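hey team, just a heads up i'm posting the complex here instead of the shared drive bc the drive is being weird again. everything in one block, sequence lines first with there labels, then the predicted structure for the whole assembly after. its twelve chains so it's a bit long, scroll down
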Amino acid sequence: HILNSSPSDRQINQLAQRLGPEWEPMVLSLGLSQTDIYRCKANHPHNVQSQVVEAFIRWRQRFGKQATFQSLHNGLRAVEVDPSLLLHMLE
Amino acid sequence: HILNSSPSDRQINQLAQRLGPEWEPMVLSLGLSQTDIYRCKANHPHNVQSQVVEAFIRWRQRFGKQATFQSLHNGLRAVEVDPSLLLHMLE
Amino acid sequence: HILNSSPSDRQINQLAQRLGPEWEPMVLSLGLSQTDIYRCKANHPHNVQSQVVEAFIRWRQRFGKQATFQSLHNGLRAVEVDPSLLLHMLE
Amino acid sequence: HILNSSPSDRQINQLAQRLGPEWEPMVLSLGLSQTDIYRCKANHPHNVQSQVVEAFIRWRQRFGKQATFQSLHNGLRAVEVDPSLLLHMLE
Amino acid sequence: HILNSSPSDRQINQLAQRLGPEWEPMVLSLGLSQTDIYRCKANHPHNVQSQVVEAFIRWRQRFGKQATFQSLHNGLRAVEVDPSLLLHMLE
Amino acid sequence: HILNSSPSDRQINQLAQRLGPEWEPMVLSLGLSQTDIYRCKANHPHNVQSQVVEAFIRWRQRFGKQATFQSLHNGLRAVEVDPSLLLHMLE
Amino acid sequence: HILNSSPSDRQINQLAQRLGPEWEPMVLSLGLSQTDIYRCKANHPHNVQSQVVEAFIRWRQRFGKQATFQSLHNGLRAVEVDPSLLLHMLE
Amino acid sequence: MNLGDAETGFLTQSNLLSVAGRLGLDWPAVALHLGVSYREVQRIRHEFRDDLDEQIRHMLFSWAERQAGQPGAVGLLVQALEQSDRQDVAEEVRAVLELG
Amino acid sequence: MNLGDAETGFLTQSNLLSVAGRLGLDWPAVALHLGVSYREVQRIRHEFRDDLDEQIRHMLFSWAERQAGQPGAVGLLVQALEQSDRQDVAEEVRAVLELG
Amino acid sequence: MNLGDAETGFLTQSNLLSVAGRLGLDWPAVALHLGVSYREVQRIRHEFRDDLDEQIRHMLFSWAERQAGQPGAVGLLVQALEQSDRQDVAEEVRAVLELG
Amino acid sequence: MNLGDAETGFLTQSNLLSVAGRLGLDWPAVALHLGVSYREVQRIRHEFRDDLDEQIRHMLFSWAERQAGQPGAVGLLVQALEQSDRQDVAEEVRAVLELG
Amino acid sequence: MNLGDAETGFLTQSNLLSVAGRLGLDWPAVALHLGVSYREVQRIRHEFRDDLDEQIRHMLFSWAERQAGQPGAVGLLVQALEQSDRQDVAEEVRAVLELG
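-- predicted structure starts here --
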């Protein structure tokens, strides 16, 4: 229904806030490479939040129309985390 | 009485000094989550002090007026530490 | 041409999720010394996930064409890890 | 005597050189907040020398007169570090 | 023949993309100095991509004709990387 | 003849590459302080390789003329390491 | 008479090397408690070398008096380490 | 500058200036939640790369200018600060604001 | 705007302008793939050090200026954005552009 | 300038310059705190972008003028510098304000 | 381009130009022991925020002007470089300085 | 223009432009190694602060003029490009020469 639309800037920010270490593994099962992540940590040495958010803007950009919640969901699971975040963060 | 006000950054830092590995359990029973812990650890990979100080900061920042010296007190028992630390870090 | 091609950054992100403290003996059985061990371990102190994932990126960059999916099976057998965990991540 | 004056642009630069991991806990007990520090860190990503100076320039520009070597002496002590450091960069 | 040739603005740009945190070591063994690399991180503080890009321009300039795809190839191995990047980026 | 000259950056690079976790002691034994290290770790949080490279540059720059291959050798030994390194990188 | 004179940055790094896995139980009689050793294992998770090296650094910022080279006899052998290592490291 | 109405209360420059002061490297959050594009957060990080204080400042005061007319202004900020995990700061604003 | 061709379609000032608005610090990546001299990127980055937008816009429109005549520059642009990892915008460009 | 009444104390351009030159990039703090509009801090900055020192002066004097007559307009300068975390220059202005 | 007497030795531009190329992100450290104010180190870091090089050249050469005559202008520089934990470049400078 | 004699080497307005354009933000170095003082680099930069091309071209021809007949002029440009890590350019010249 909405699992086909891409997350917004603000939305990526909220998602990011709720991810711990699993973000790295996550973005991998999503389409980025060690390089992309390294370039994220690169651009925001101090402060992780900013790293993660970029990683995601990174993702959503490389996959345009395809970088969607559906994809996000599948990734969240691939990294063993409840896809509840999505639904709840959507209220 | 002073118990009903949040500690300053100097105060926090002094506490961050007299705390050992139990700080994590403590900040947990205080309201933070295993996530906030990791980010604190990830924001200061080298330098433990900074981790603890940021956790507690995050703690104060999340609960605002409710992050009181009373909580710190409780937080200490929570993790079985003698509450007089708060005293000898207020003199 | 399945056991002659190297895996991607998504796959290694899996062969690292489901593994125990015995991955190190397994990553040395491919061409990594104690210089690459005290490194993948150093560039990621907290979040052992990316520690394991880099051990392999350190593995596929030093071998390239000869770093086949057969090589990641050469160690599995030599560490008690059933050689069938490479097909459950591709089914 | 000099005990009640204020370190200069050059003297600070000196002090900075010799301080390490505790430069953060030091400037906290001097009057800076955790937010000041993030500004230093951020305003000088690569390079800690530059960070620690801004840290001290702030502290002197905030407490003007009251930013004496006396203050620094206590601080150093406070942050568990030989107070003689001030003696060595004053010759 | 194309080996004893110098990469173009376009090609340096492309190659830079592929490179991870091992660019520093690659440019070091290619002729640039620790003093040069800093000039790169400084000029583009939070954009590793353009850092790596200036670095190879610096290089191609410092050594002129001496800076050939060939010598570029050696740099890749010397830092533990698959020199096939050069071909998968030249199609 | 050559043992009384300081190592270039292209060298210190290869030296650091082949050093594991023992580098920490080796440099404290070469003249730097624990402090100098934190600064190196501080300046390159994500990427140990660099921490070392910088750690050595500080050394060379601090001592200049005296930071000679000869001095490194003793360092290598003093930290129970096979001096074959110098004789190796020098090929 | 060097029995009443503390060590240094190159001395403390020589005693830290030889000391076996008893660098935790040895400091449990010299003057370091539990918020001290677990404050070193933390700052440096990996490299069990610099953890021991940051412990004796606490032997000159908190002690200094009954902690020089004479309190190194009742401490080393207070954990199965004959105090003759004091003479063979002072050569 | 000219934030809020008579009923809710107003926000002086000194106030907004105080918020910018309590913000750190989490500025981008408050900005995203305030509905600023990510593309823009980045753009600001550039125009003032050497000065954090100014980026935190420019972000605020520019959003301030934008919402110069709007009513729910001071409301949106407080909410954004809440969601950025700074109840901390949300309460100071609600407080100063206490007067209408 | 004279960027395109009668069969495929043309882009309007505002269309490119959108592309410019959606690019950020990555712009150089695009510009170089678009085949711009690193010296030109270098220059522009200097002539407008303070204004990020102006860099992106000048780069983009100068490039359009040069490709004016040409056969398929909208293709080069779509490809360059795709190789700069901005499928993101490449698609946004195909959408409008693709009319003919 | 004529900044200062016989009561409080005066302030010569020489005293004003003593200030402008002791101020860094935190100028906009001092500015905004003196009630200086942010579009003015914005305008001033740009209208002299290449010369930092001309900014700190144009801002400080343009404002020193608007305070033609006015009471403790000198106290305003001092209080601003004070909430701009610069007791630094605040006390130097108190010291110079030691004429009688 | 005019430092030192014949007793001590001189320092061409090619000379100081290199002393500059030999300095990195520690330039501020040097110019501080040289006598430059943090206020001015900052004024410079800002005027060339997108060019580390010109930041350093401008730093040194602008200090070379203000040194036009004086006694051991060159002696001081060597002193700073040492004082800035760079026995490294302290020695080369003394080297090339051999002629008097 | 008319740089170099009928032997040493020839460099026409053409060639001089070829170089001018091939330089960029590092020109102050080439100029500094060529002899020009930091005061003139400064002046040329302020007489065209925004237009880079002109700064370069004006600086190179200003010097071209001065080295009128002078023999070792061409070789001096070359020795200057080399000292500014632009072997890059230094070879463009070495080749343009071996045609006369």
